[PDB]
Design a protein around this ligand. Structure first.
Ligand SMILES: NC(=O)c1ccc[n+]([C@@H]2O[C@H](COP(=O)([O-])OP(=O)(O)OC[C@H]3O[C@@H](n4cnc5c(N)ncnc54)[C@H](O)[C@@H]3O)[C@@H](O)[C@H]2O)c1
Ligand SMILES: NC(=O)c1ccc[n+]([C@@H]2O[C@H](COP(=O)([O-])OP(=O)(O)OC[C@H]3O[C@@H](n4cnc5c(N)ncnc54)[C@H](O)[C@@H]3O)[C@@H](O)[C@H]2O)c1
Ligand SMILES: NC(=O)c1ccc[n+]([C@@H]2O[C@H](COP(=O)([O-])OP(=O)(O)OC[C@H]3O[C@@H](n4cnc5c(N)ncnc54)[C@H](O)[C@@H]3O)[C@@H](O)[C@H]2O)c1
Ligand SMILES: NC(=O)c1ccc[n+]([C@@H]2O[C@H](COP(=O)([O-])OP(=O)(O)OC[C@H]3O[C@@H](n4cnc5c(N)ncnc54)[C@H](O)[C@@H]3O)[C@@H](O)[C@H]2O)c1
Ligand SMILES: Nc1ncnc2c1ncn2[C@@H]1O[C@H](CO)[C@@H](O)[C@H]1O
Ligand SMILES: [K+]
Ligand SMILES: [K+]
Ligand SMILES: [K+]
Lengths: 461, 461, 460, 461
């Protein structure tokens, strides 16, 4: 009916939720505005998104708006057990344990679609595309397409076996559920990229709102969020001194940028790697030495990958690294580091999400969260405030695709700027940030209304 | 023939160009790449752009590409005399003096179009849109439209007089010149906004390249440039101690962002104003107190405007200010501050571009560059390296519109991403910034090619 | 031995393996003095936060020949896995995270109770509690009225512990006092206490002020707090730093580190001070300098760093806004008027995190019940910076044990050449390459190429 | 009665003062607090200190507190002629002309001891110790010691010639002047050095206050002052871009620490060299790479020296540097850089205080101020606020010695901490910094009084 680590943690979860709500004015404002109206009454939402305290506040907001939901995490180490307990105790089905196996993970992703009345979900709230991919690959398998062979990875084999179990247990499930989905809201860059791949190949059968690319998501969550929680995760994992140390940051997109500020602000000296010349130029301009990991690996104290790509930190890199160098990843998936390549070496667990890996020559590495997003694995992810900006976009995205589904075609959308502006505006008071108002004449003079939007569609901020 | 302050400054100018070239790899790469093939042979370029050492390197670069140019500055205080002189000494006609009057400014603007063979220019390279407007408003006047009446500013009246003057001396001039322009490239936000007004009204009769919105322009020039050059201007103008002082930055776009960094990085404590809630939330997140000038004026030590709007610092604000508060503008035009409203009071010149204005109660203000761009007025504007990234776009813009004019409609375009990435790429070596190369598998994995472009069309960086 | 759970020892040992690679000072001292055993015969009573870092120190003192008995100097600052690892070696330790006041003082007394019945001969102290216990006890034994009118609950427990000891083994305090060759004192608040003793003629043995080594006060107190303040506030509250206003009370070494901690994490810092010079430094460093009276009502975070008392009062706490976070990183829990909060409704959120509700409904988040939140809510300063602090401790123990007769009953600091050696020992770890003076250069500036490089009272 | 370059420039001097005063709250507040009580009535002060506008404000402050004064520069080139003029217009004897002869210099030093009533000085206010040493050496000569033979330098022969001139002219002048000095204050490290040697050899015949080691003066000059004026100097000189650049700072004392902050704050990436392991460890902990100039020279873009040593940047380093490396000294005071060693290479002057030096292989260097102090050479020295903190120390020292002469032995003393604190208080209000007051209970608790001093004699702050 629910799967959590320990239901007795509910009370603790609840207390922290009391606190988080005072930090999340966006979601609370959505409860005020849409509670009575109940725009999501009739919504049947399967959520796949880090089961944190922040996600719990979102979940309860969705419910206040009329939705029924079933939830699971989008990572095996990112759950906050007391958050999961507190949500479970309300009766909302949740399947999320910090430290679950891969098999369990896919079992749980499946569970979010298994409603008691035997009818399907009609909405997906996704982070990384795992729930979306599960349905769409499932359905194609059910249509006879050969899509469950030649598994590239362990994780992929486990995903396949889970699709096979579901096909056998309830034939027609995927087909039926693919058709039942009114729309999906996608939270993160890696997820959005998967959406665009689908659209480009004509494999997206319903509309998606790209939540990541709201300005109040990508330029806040991905950047400030990582600034807050990257060093947090490293610190809890290792308790290492930042001052005096060299940290190499692989990638200089939004996450990479935030990550560099996280480390720099703590006193580490930051070096950056990149493949995009524009982002690399930014990094240099921002004061950072721009290197390759091939050149910088053997003298780094800390190495962090932020790319969304793969094989960024390889076994060759890790052999060069000096004793006790700290290795971690804060991009969505664990393949940015070649962890699988380290499995034939001697591992000593230090504590949860902290492992000492020993090379033939006696050199040791400290690996965080087994190569999974270390901010959520080693700590608690992004603070409540920033998550409020992200999740308010999520709420608006859900309202759009559920209540105005016919306005949308089978493609990836972003929310309109006036909504983006609304989201930021909701978070200003909380910080005691006083906004100036344009005179009618000033607005005229620069080509806008006093009410906004204030920028052209593709302004970059 | 030419008009500069003092032709004997040429040697100094020349020595600073030898140095400046080592700081502008973008422009020097273009000379190597397009020198022999001479894509601008037959170009007759009228340039209206701050006549600085940086612009001088651009001018020589355009000549090396085959172009013949005639130049003027786009601001009465922004010239560097020794740069103007070095350019005049090569025989290129240049009409720019630091501290020219309004009348002189328009006389020079007109001169850039007066070729010795009596034939019109065929290209414009513009910053602010003054040279473009002149031709266009002049042409309309010639067609009998009533565009020369009810002038709002002293500046508007002198522009009208100059247009009439030219109409009488050489009838048909504006119309024959309008028709002869193959294209215009526009440098800055305020100019680009003017262009969009035109296009919108159907009043753009040729293609325009919006250089401002190149990523390697807006996110570098407008941000990092002002970071370098705002306090530079304030220090040269006032020698005030920064640590311990409170500065108010009005606006938090690309310029306000850089301006804030400029002051903070020098030790001042920075408060920010904004009308855009997303930009305000960025400023609060960046650790700045977000206030209204109404509330903050009376205790500020420094007040700077960066909006490109008008009437941002009013007479009411300046009244509230404390004795010796420094006031400046770094947006494109002198109407952001209500300087006209100060003409009423007792001025005392302190030195070039620094005035002490005394209110009735005896309260004094220090006004910088008479409320015009203080970075260029009180110092020398942005350093060479950043102007190289900015100006390398200009050169590519000219090459496009001059060699491929038939591919463009009467609209505002931006350069393609691959060119933006090229520009960045040409600046990496100068900084010892070494780029990583995607493996074939890696590029496939994220949906790009190893040669780029690496980001979707509207990626915000 | 008393620890939370001896089964944590393996975990503690793994983190010691790691900590050692971060603490080259201590490991160097093992190399230099291990065979020579300068502390052979030393019987050291240690009262210092029983963290992983302190565990590396303890093992270093043992490599040098010492026998030790250890207790923490704060009820919340122990890391149970460190305590366990140390206990597993056979070294007597008495330290549990979350001990009661009564337990604390039982453990402080335990560090002086050796199996053979003979007294300790050295004290390694942090905050002065172990030193005060012996000194106040010995005066009570000599008949002085020093155990009356207790001014706090904690003071009451101390008096009862002293009375309990005098009853069990009469004469213990007098004999232990006389048996102490010397004490080394780690922290500002402890040193302050020593100076008060010396001024009154109540210091009966030499003390090394380890806090005022440049490689301690200008590193530990500053960089240490830079690293660990925000750490403790994040683990306790997971609050967003960006966009928030934090008021730091005090701008000495710790207050300076603390401001950097919060600012570098995104918070906007305002600072209070009583010392005009320190205030001017704050303003020069870019911080708004305010009174808490004025700033209290709009702050999001308020942190005290003074070593003083009654800095954050009931009146301030009344003015604060709902969900304001309140903590202290000075040595003692009286900087904040915690006791004045005791009749209000408290709800525990989790260890060292409490929600306190006022009559009007306004709630505050108090960290570690007003005790050092870096050690309370996280794990204190990182190993590297503590290696600097603890290498000074080792050198100070060696001094007062091996050369006791060269010191009078006063507070001393280590000579500059030892201070420079400590810094030197930590350079390689960071890949910091030092330049060497030419003979002529040295002469030109009035030094030798070997150092010391600065005058006695150079401020750095 | 006065020697200045042009009494005509006096009105302009005054206009400069009006501005500078508003930036020197310390000295001004001194005037409001002590003006009425006239604690320097009866003072007859002989001053020797760079005759700048800042020093003019100091001077007038001394007169406001009742002091009668005669003044000269402590340097032949430091005099700002309109300051002198403004001061001589007061009726105050000033003997200072920018560019004065060495002979004339000593003649002006003598003139500050020649009062028209024929009686002697009773106080010396000194920077560098030339005015103190002149009286003391002269008096040793008049007591018959052989001290005017064996001049080490031709600059010393000017000294000795000048004492014999005065000895011959008015027998006993020196003996009687030495006996009349109540006390002297000293501003600089070199001046203190000389005095402390007098003291060690029983040659110090009166109390001296060492002001250089006040916290509010050593920190304000050395660190905050150089923080404000380093990057400023380098910009005015080269207009180079800081962002993206590597700057090597030689030495990490107070001047080095400020210099590092100046550069990092402007966007440069700072490396640091040191011989002192404590300072080096400070640098690494402040997040700077700690290197030897030997290793870092070939890739530096800016190298600045701050050591106060000699032969810091040698010809061997300069040969290794890349083309267009900028090289400067902010220490003291020439000879940190081996400039002379470069005199055979091709020098091309770019403008005042900026020289291009070319090596045999075409490698050029940009050298600032010929390797002398660049903050004075290319900028305008330290800001007024900075100098206000430092000159307020002189004042308080003067009051202290003049009014409590009896409390002092003939030794060098540092300024009492309560006065150091007083200096700070005097600047707090201008900054808007509000001081908290200890309760009587809090004060006893920590072992001080509510009035301070608040720290022990050797607290390092
Ligand atoms: N942990 C979190 O809380 C969190 C939050 C947001 C996003 N993410 C994840 O982080 C990843 C990155 O997100 P983003 O918003 O920064 O995307 P982004 O595209 O803005 O930036 C990724 C950057 O990595 C660079 N890159 C790619 N391959 C590289 C390589 N081999 N070496 C060096 N650089 C390389 C790209 O040029 C790009 O600039 C995604 O997986 C995203 O889903 C995680
Ligand atoms: N001097 C220079 O070196 C330089 C360089 C680049 C651009 N500019 C000029 O600076 C101006 C700003 O350009 P930008 O690139 O920053 O454009 P931008 O649109 O990114 O920034 C303008 C910002 O000002 C804000 N704003 C508008 N009116 C306001 C008001 N009344 N009060 C407070 N904030 C207000 C807007 O919300 C906007 O975010 C333009 O005129 C541009 O041409 C100057
Ligand atoms: N938590 C830790 O890991 C850690 C580390 C080192 C020191 N400490 C403790 O921190 C405390 C401070 O030590 P420090 O080394 O910074 O001492 P310090 O003397 O250098 O700093 C204390 C400052 O507080 C100021 N102050 C005093 N009362 C004040 C008041 N009522 N309001 C505002 N400011 C006031 C003083 O002027 C002084 O500048 C001591 O208790 C010390 O033992 C803790
Ligand atoms: N330009 C100015 O406005 C200004 C102002 C004050 C002082 N100064 C001058 O600056 C110099 C330094 O002053 P300070 O207050 O920093 O004194 P300081 O003694 O505090 O700093 C000197 C530092 O230089 C280091 N050093 C010495 N030789 C070195 C070498 N070969 N390589 C690397 N580091 C070396 C020393 O270890 C010491 O830490 C003095 O000569 C002083 O007169 C200049
Ligand atoms: N504490 C958190 N709770 C929920 N989601 C988070 C948290 N921190 C980061 N994320 C989200 O996780 C995604 C990374 O997979 C990002 O898109 C981000 O929005
Ligand atoms: K969190
Ligand atoms: K420039
Ligand atoms: K620790």
């Amino acid at each position: 009916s629910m799967v959590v680590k320990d239901i007795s943690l509910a009370d603790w979860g609840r207390k922290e939720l009391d606190i988080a709500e005072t930090e999340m004015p966006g979601l609370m404002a959505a409860r005020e505005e849409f509670g009575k109206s109940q725009p999501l009454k009739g919504a049947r939402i399967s959520g796949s998104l880090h089961m944190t305290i922040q996600t719990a506040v979102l979940i309860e907001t969705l419910k206040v708006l009329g939705a029924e939901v079933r939830w699971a995490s989008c990572n095996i180490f990112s759950t906050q057990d007391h958050a999961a307990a507190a949500i479970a105790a309300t009766g909302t089905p949740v399947f999320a344990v910090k430290g679950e196996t891969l098999e369990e993970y896919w079992t749980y992703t499946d569970q979010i679609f298994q409603w008691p009345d035997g009818e399907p979900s009609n909405m997906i709230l996704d982070d990384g595309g795992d729930a979306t991919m599960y349905i769409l690959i499932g359905a194609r398998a059910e249509a006879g397409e050969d899509v469950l062979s030649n598994p590239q990875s362990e994780e992929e084999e486990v995903l396949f076996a889970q699709i096979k179990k579901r096909m056998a247990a309830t034939p027609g499930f995927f087909t039926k559920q693919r058709a039942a989905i009114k729309g999906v809201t996608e939270e993160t860059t890696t997820g959005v990229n998967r959406l665009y791949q689908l659209q480009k190949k004509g494999l997206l059968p319903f509309p998606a709102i790209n939540v990541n690319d709201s300005v109040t998501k990508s330029k806040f969550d991905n950047k400030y969020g990582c600034k807050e929680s990257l060093v947090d995760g490293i610190r809890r994992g290792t308790d290492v001194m930042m001052a005096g140390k060299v940290a190499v940051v692989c990638g200089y997109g939004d996450v990479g940028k935030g990550s560099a500020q996280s480390l720099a602000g703590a006193g580490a000296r930051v070096k950056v790697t990149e493949v995009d010349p524009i982002c690399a130029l930014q990094a240099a301009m921002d004061g950072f030495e721009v290197v390759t990991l091939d050149d910088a690996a053997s003298t780094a104290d800390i190495v962090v990958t932020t790319t969304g790509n793969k094989d960024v930190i390889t076994i060759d890199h890790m052999r060069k690294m000096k004793d006790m160098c700290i290795v971690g990843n804060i991009g969505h998936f664990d393949n940015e580091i070649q962890v699988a390549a380290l499995r034939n070496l001697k591992w000593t667990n230090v504590k949860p999400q902290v492992d000492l890996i020993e090379f033939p020559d006696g050199k040791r590495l400290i690996l965080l969260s087994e190569g999974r997003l270390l901010n959520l694995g080693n700590a608690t992810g992004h603070p409540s405030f920033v998550m409020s900006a992200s999740f308010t976009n999520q709420v608006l995205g859900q309202i759009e695709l559920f209540t105005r589904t016919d306005a949308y075609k089978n493609e990836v959308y972003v929310l309109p700027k006036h909504l983006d502006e609304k989201v930021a505006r909701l978070h200003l008071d909380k910080l005691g940030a006083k906004l100036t108002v344009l005179s009618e004449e000033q607005a005229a003079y620069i080509g806008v209304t006093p009410q906004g939007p204030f920028k052209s569609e593709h302004y970059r901020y």
